[PDB]
Amino acid sequence: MLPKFDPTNQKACLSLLEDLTTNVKQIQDSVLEAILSRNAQTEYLRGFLNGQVDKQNFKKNVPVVTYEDIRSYIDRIANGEPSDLICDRPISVLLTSSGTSGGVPKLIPLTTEDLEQRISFSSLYAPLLYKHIDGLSEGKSLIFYFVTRESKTANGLMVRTMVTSFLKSIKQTNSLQVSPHAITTCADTTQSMYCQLLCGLLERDNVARLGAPFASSFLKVIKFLEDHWPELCSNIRTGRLSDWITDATCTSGIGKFLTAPNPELASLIEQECSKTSWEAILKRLWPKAKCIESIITGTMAQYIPLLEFYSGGLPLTSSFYGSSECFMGVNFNPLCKPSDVSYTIIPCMGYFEFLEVEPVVVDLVDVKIGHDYEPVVTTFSGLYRYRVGDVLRATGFYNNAPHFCFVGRQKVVLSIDMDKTYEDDLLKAVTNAKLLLEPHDLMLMDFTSRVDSSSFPGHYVIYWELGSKVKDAKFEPNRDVMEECCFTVEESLDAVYRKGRKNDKNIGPLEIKVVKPGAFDELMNFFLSRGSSVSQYKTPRSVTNEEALKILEANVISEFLSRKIPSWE
Ligand SMILES: O=C(O)COc1ccc(Cl)cc1Cl
């Protein structure tokens, strides 16, 4: 647990963060003893430990598990069995996660104490942000987030996202500009995005930070602005909400900010939105914002160049490393280069072990710099030695606390037969290849992929949506550069792929298909119409569903094949 502290006392908060990252071994051992002692009579723990609370019996007798191994406990609680199947405290909500098992979202128990500890630690960490980001304390955080539905279990437990649970709790015991639909559901995402942007624009002079779950989340906001800014501004000029907004939360709530006709504010926003280039639009619309906070690591690293284009120099920050299962780390250097983000594990948030990636698990303090690990977390909400499914690389120490860079999920995205191409390798390959377009004033906006086993020999298909700065005439890549892009992806894949191409002969030439602009919004709307969470949506890096494939296939303009065979010993 975390000690009592004054969140208004910035020096006391920073001094506590130093303590927390210095006494790492002692805090970890304290956390473990507390979890094992308090949960000793749960059905889950007693079956393995029979009352022991010492670390060595823990390591010997408690198995390392995945969500698949423990799902039955969660389902039984969802059906009405008591929280003490897994936890000595009541389960207050189930969290719907991104990442599945299988093929639905994981449902993760959360206790009220765990939730308040996470909120507590967030207020412990904000003074560091304020110390690093001048002016951040001077205004509000405009957070682009909304929820379109929620549910409850058979026994009546609420099912929510972690963000909603986080916001709802700090709201119930208090600086944030958050949409009326971050907590209260609205099925119409058009109404919810409209009201949230209207509020954000009305409050633009009070906004010190922009936030969203992911880097790509901002592109959906910007796309909506491109289509609807004149109507938004018209509402600001007249002080009158457009009458097609029927959602009761927006219509009853909007009067708080839409207080009177404001022609001058409307004209200011129109002046920015009517410019040809939307470069720096985010800073121009929110000129007092001090940073843009979202996940920019892993798959989201792909959107950094485009988000920086819209950012006008606002630093892109990624402050937090966490999951439904556990809040895990923070960035002690929030203004670092987005490519240099590392997260320091916070020892009081759980007991953290690490599985070497390449059966061998080490304690947090025994991690090896430069080696890859999957976190194995033991928590205060009924998870014990639970595999989180991320791969982190240990990069150093903040005081005595290891810090890690996010490598990726552990996920095969493409496989013709014995080739198993992982998401992190495909991402690095596409990163290498898309660089070749920079001399031609072209940018890769998004991509996905599929295995084409139709014919003779199977091969990878990568779908590329391209854009540029010229809105005046057609843009198009020459075939020579596209063909070298194909090769550069291939040369970046692993030895099994490359041996397949050069030696084995069972893998054919990689293919890049350029899709028309808007292809990846059509793809997204396809998944949304089938129940995907809007706020948790990420472009999947490969697609198998036949209706999504048919969507990508009829957006295809040009196709290109690698003309060179990749190298391999
Ligand atoms: O750790 C995480 O996964 C994200 O946590 C948060 C941090 C800050 C704010 Cl404002 C909201 C949330 Cl959900």
Ligand SMILES: O=C(O)COc1ccc(Cl)cc1Cl
């Ligand atoms: O921006 C902020 O205020 C804190 O970070 C977040 C807040 C809300 C959401 Cl959804 C995602 C992120 Cl990364």
